[PDB]
Amino acid sequence: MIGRLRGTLAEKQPPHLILDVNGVGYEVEVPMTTLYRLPSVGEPVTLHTHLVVREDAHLLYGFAEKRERELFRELIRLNGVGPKLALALMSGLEVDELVRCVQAQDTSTLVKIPGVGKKTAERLLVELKDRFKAW
Amino acid sequence: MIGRLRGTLAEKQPPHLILDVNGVGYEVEVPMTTLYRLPSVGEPVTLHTHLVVREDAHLLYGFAEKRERELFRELIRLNGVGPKLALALMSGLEVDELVRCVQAQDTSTLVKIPGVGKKTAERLLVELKDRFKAW
Amino acid sequence: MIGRLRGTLAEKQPPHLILDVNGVGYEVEVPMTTLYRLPSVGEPVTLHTHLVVREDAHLLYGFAEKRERELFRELIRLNGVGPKLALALMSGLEVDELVRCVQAQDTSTLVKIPGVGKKTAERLLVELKDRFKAWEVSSAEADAVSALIALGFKPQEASRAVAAVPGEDLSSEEMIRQALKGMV
Amino acid sequence: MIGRLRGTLAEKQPPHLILDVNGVGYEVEVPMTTLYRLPSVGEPVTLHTHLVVREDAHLLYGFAEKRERELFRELIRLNGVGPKLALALMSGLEVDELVRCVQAQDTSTLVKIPGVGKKTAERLLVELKDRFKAWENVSSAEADAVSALIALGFKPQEASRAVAAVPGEDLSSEEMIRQALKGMV
Amino acid sequence: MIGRLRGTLAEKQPPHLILDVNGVGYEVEVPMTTLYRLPSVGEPVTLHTHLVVREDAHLLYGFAEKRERELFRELIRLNGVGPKLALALMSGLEVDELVRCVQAQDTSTLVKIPGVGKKTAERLLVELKDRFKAWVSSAEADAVSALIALGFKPQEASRAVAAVPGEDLSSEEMIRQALKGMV
Amino acid sequence: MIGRLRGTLAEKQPPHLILDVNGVGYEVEVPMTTLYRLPSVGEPVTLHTHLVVREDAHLLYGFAEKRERELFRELIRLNGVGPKLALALMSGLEVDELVRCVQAQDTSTLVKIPGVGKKTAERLLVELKDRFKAWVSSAEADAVSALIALGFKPQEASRAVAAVPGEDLSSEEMIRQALKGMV
Amino acid sequence: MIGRLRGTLAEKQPPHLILDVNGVGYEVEVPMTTLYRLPSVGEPVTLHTHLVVREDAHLLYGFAEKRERELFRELIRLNGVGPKLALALMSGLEVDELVRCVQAQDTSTLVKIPGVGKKTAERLLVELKDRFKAW
DNA sequence: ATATTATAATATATAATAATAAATATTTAATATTATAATA
DNA sequence: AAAATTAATATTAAATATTTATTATTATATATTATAATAT
DNA sequence: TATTATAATATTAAATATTATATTTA
DNA sequence: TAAATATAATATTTAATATTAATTTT
């Protein structure tokens, strides 16, 4: 329903974020790696946003790039894992090292990422064995 | 509920599109026939869209014409047809071709669409026979 | 969640509307009485709106006044009344006409509206009689109370004496006499 | 979905509001405490709205600053608290008042607010003292002692933790109850 | 629905019990305290029961006492209490002792129950505080009326009247025995 | 699914009961009049039970007569009527005067039932007049008023008046025999 | 809600059954293995049953053993496993063979069970390696 | 012969308790994960 | 013309248990009303 | 220096039947 | 060329009743 957002930075209150667009501010959830990429408060910055919908509320996810957003979608399409373990994973590592790690089939590097044990690490490996291309 | 959408094409990625309407770029997917009528990235393009509201998702489907959106509404009103079957019908063939073949009670022109079997074709024709006395 | 729009009428068709707000045109359905008051396509129009929120599909329904939207919210809060039933209702009759018909318990005026049967009139009257009363202990008794206070009665005893009998259509002097003759 | 609206107050009808942003008005409800500082109609205001998603309706709940925004979302996060409850709480009194009362644990300040009874008051006290408000935003002798305290005006909690703090072991009742009476001072 | 079972025990796999009532076994669990009162395999047993209906499951809970069922039901009516919590509580401590601790509102005796947080303890104690109640013949009616005229409440008089003296005794002696009590 | 049960009354606490139907006991909530016409605990009886199902609970409400069960059915069929309202109205009064007051369009008869507002009863009139297609004296109040003005407490005076009313005799003589009660 | 059913075989239409217990004959779904352990029609027999409850239907799945019921419970307690899937699982081959296969990570033998792909088989292997925990 | 006022009753403003009806709020069960206290 | 019947046909949506201001109704001193004799 | 039961917390949640149609193997 | 088998994709309310139009008889 929503794919991208282009507005000025209303404030910076991590890990939440408000983007004032046409005077309208949106609550978005942002990775720490993207927090290293954000400009100053009041800077017009483009965020590629994805929405999740549950029965009592919703959360947006403003992202600075596409392929991170589609990998978010592919991960959250799994029933065993939700969005916030994905947030921990993406705050742990970026796209390319995760791609080689799942292609190398290693749970150990996923273990050091906080909030993740071992069994969910081979969950990520098994489920994402044959989903995507190398880009 | 947006009945018509008029913004600038932020990016092009099949089969979706992102229309940056004054800063906000909606995740909008349109059929390929509209993609033949779609200008390049950055052009102000007007779409007669309609939102599909789900318990866990919301989908926008833009249309360059009002009547194709109306036919999309008629198709999704059918008990077994969702958004993507109607998407296949819109992408495969043209609206006047559909109404002529329904008046002709054709089936082969429908089955030849990929993803369409004899069952869905005979369905759409026989539950659509009653309509189109008004035009 | 939404109260009003300042937009541009991108397209009108019975019975919906398209209001191009900053490039975004919303599907807004309006009654025929509102449709008569609307200017042409491309004119900014004043619609005070309410969204009907259902799991599978929403409904944007706007009105030229706050009062129409508020009364529609009252009608949709009712038990067996749906939205387009009430849309037919104010398409048929206006706010003053409906309010006065409710206060007069009228049915014949409103049964000309299509979709309205006898049970429709029953439910609308039974709800709207007590949902709203005003739409946008007597002077002789007080004089009697003061006169009996001057006569030596306590205010409580004077109130009890004047409330003992329901004096009707009688002057202040004679109602005191009939109340005083009443219990004795 | 909504956090802030750089727009103008299109209408002011208590307790609701219409806040116009680029011609788009929204049905917004705010507490009376906000309504005291809200400027005139048409003036560009500062008000942090909050969306609540239901299967049947949606409403917007504005707030002047971040502190009462966070207070509201955390109060609604409780199992027993609805929107109008926190709206009445903020309309009655301010964030500093409620936090300084909760750390003082007096229900009397809470219960004078209309729609707020006793049970809601100990719910607020207990479930806020349950880790949110550090930062600004027996034997025969002991049973005999407890029964004597109940008969002498003591509510059971002060008769309980006094026994717990200084329990009596293998000695007569009169002296550990005596030092417990010195203990509660 | 289900209020009580009078059936025959089929197998014992604690805490899950199967009760073959006329050919059909019933999936019911009992607390370990009730494990200390179950009969052997094949022996009939009468269990006071009450069901729980979930969105995707139906769960059956059966106790030795009706009052235990009522206390369990009132625990389930609490907003933060699930069946696992109530089974942990009653597997820790028995019913009237927990009632008196609710009168005490003490967390020390309930924290020791495994898997139970202190915050859970005070919230359940506060929302379970005592709003509930604490746990005729010619001579009977004559005594009840006499003590009503003497100022005693009818419910207060009846429990002193019907307890100590027998059935159909002399009115004078049974009124005497009813008024033998002191507080 | 279920319409009738024929078992043995294992336990009867108001307003419910336990009917042990072939080894299985059901908690069935029945009205006050039904409880009045039920036999003792342990006596077999057949009951016109109505199936009640919620997404997270299920109940039964049994009757000694079928027409009670169908009338309960169309009462619950109304959106604005819950089970407690129907149970209260049928516990307070009998069904024949209910259908006659529906025909007579009477409200104050229904209002005196506890938990019944004027709007609730008047609505019940509104839908029941279309649902149903085929299917004390002046001296009594005078004595009460005279006793109230004399000095008697209003409710015990009415108790004395209604204990032995003057249905077949004059007001002065029924006052004379009503003053027997409090002596 | 029913863990054991001592009834009489009224009807034999595989893989469904009717156990007329005191005049009441429920639908009883059994695997083909239990069908080999099943006696003839009219023979009283005890089945150890399990309940599945969803919003539109209830079904009975009666087994010859406790351990069969418990294993079926723990397979349906998985996220991506349906009832007919596990039905085909114990219909294909025996329980202790399944335990040996998952302890030996034998995806090949589990593949030869009909209706089971390689992906589903290795899912079963990885989510059942440690769940048995050698009893 | 008028008040007056020194002793005598009195009646209710202010404490309390007991239904009650409009107005809401409406989810826990299972399981990883991570501390964490205690431990060969 | 004039009421009764029936087949489509669009429409509508299901809420209970609790809870707190909001009304009842029950004492309790205390600032009032009162009288009597009494000088002047 | 690992190692394990316990507890608080913080997530995540729950679809499955029915066709259309790829390779594949005769 | 004819299916087999996963494989993936795609899809997924109901009763129940009140109004109304055409018909039918008087």
Swiss-Prot record, chain C:
Gene name of this polypeptide: ruvA
DNA repair as UniProt keyword: yes
Function: The RuvA-RuvB-RuvC complex processes Holliday junction (HJ) DNA during genetic recombination and DNA repair, while the RuvA-RuvB complex plays an important role in the rescue of blocked DNA replication forks via replication fork reversal (RFR). RuvA specifically binds to HJ cruciform DNA, conferring on it an open structure. The RuvB hexamer acts as an ATP-dependent pump, pulling dsDNA into and through the RuvAB complex. HJ branch migration allows RuvC to scan DNA until it finds its consensus sequence, where it cleaves and resolves the cruciform DNA. Complements an E.coli deletion mutant.
GO BP terms in the entry: DNA recombination; DNA repair; SOS response
Upper classification of the organism: Bacteria, Pseudomonadati, Pseudomonadota, Gammaproteobacteria, Pseudomonadales
Family assignment from sequence similarity: Belongs to the RuvA family.
Domain of life: Bacteria
Residues forming coiled coils: none
Keywords: Cytoplasm, DNA damage, DNA recombination, DNA repair, DNA-binding
Protein name as it appears in the record: Holliday junction branch migration complex subunit RuvA
Sequence segments annotated as region (Domain II): 65-136
Keyword DNA-binding set for record: yes
Region ranges (Domain I): 1-64
From Swiss-Prot, chains E, F:
Domain remark text: Has three domains with a flexible linker between the domains II and III and assumes an 'L' shape. Domain III is highly mobile and contacts RuvB.
Protein name per the record: Holliday junction branch migration complex subunit RuvA
Main subcellular localisation: cytoplasm
Top-level taxonomic group: Bacteria
Keyword terms, alphabetized: Cytoplasm, DNA damage, DNA recombination, DNA repair, DNA-binding
Quaternary structure annotation from Swiss-Prot or TrEMBL: Homotetramer. Forms an RuvA(8)-RuvB(12)-Holliday junction (HJ) complex. HJ DNA is sandwiched between 2 RuvA tetramers; dsDNA enters through RuvA and exits via RuvB. An RuvB hexamer assembles on each DNA strand where it exits the tetramer. Each RuvB hexamer is contacted by two RuvA subunits (via domain III) on 2 adjacent RuvB subunits; this complex drives branch migration. In the full resolvosome a probable DNA-RuvA(4)-RuvB(12)-RuvC(2) complex forms which resolves the HJ.
SUPFAM superfamilies: DNA helicase RuvA subunit, C-terminal domain, Nucleic acid-binding proteins, RuvA domain 2-like
GO cellular component: cytoplasm; Holliday junction helicase complex; Holliday junction resolvase complex
Single biological process term from Gene Ontology: DNA recombination
UniProt keyword Transmembrane helix present: no
Family membership noted in the UniProt record: Belongs to the RuvA family.
InterPro entries: DNA_helicase_Holl-junc_RuvA_I, Hlx-hairpin-Hlx_DNA-bd_motif, NA-bd_OB-fold, RuvA, RuvA_2-like, RuvA_C, RuvA_C_sf
Domain I: annotated segments: 1-64
Misc note: Probably part of a ruvC-ruvA-ruvB operon. Does not seem to belong to the SOS regulon, no LexA binding site has been identified in the promoter region.
Region feature (Domain II): 65-135
SMART domains in the cross-refs: HhH1
Organism this protein belongs to: Pseudomonas aeruginosa (strain ATCC 15692 / DSM 22644 / CIP 104116 / JCM 14847 / LMG 12228 / 1C / PRS 101 / PAO1)
Job of this protein: The RuvA-RuvB-RuvC complex processes Holliday junction (HJ) DNA during genetic recombination and DNA repair, while the RuvA-RuvB complex plays an important role in the rescue of blocked DNA replication forks via replication fork reversal (RFR). RuvA specifically binds to HJ cruciform DNA, conferring on it an open structure. The RuvB hexamer acts as an ATP-dependent pump, pulling dsDNA into and through the RuvAB complex. HJ branch migration allows RuvC to scan DNA until it finds its consensus sequence, where it cleaves and resolves the cruciform DNA. Complements an E.coli deletion mutant.
Region (Domain III): 136-183
GO terms of molecular function: ATP binding; four-way junction DNA binding; four-way junction helicase activity
Compartments where located: Cytoplasm
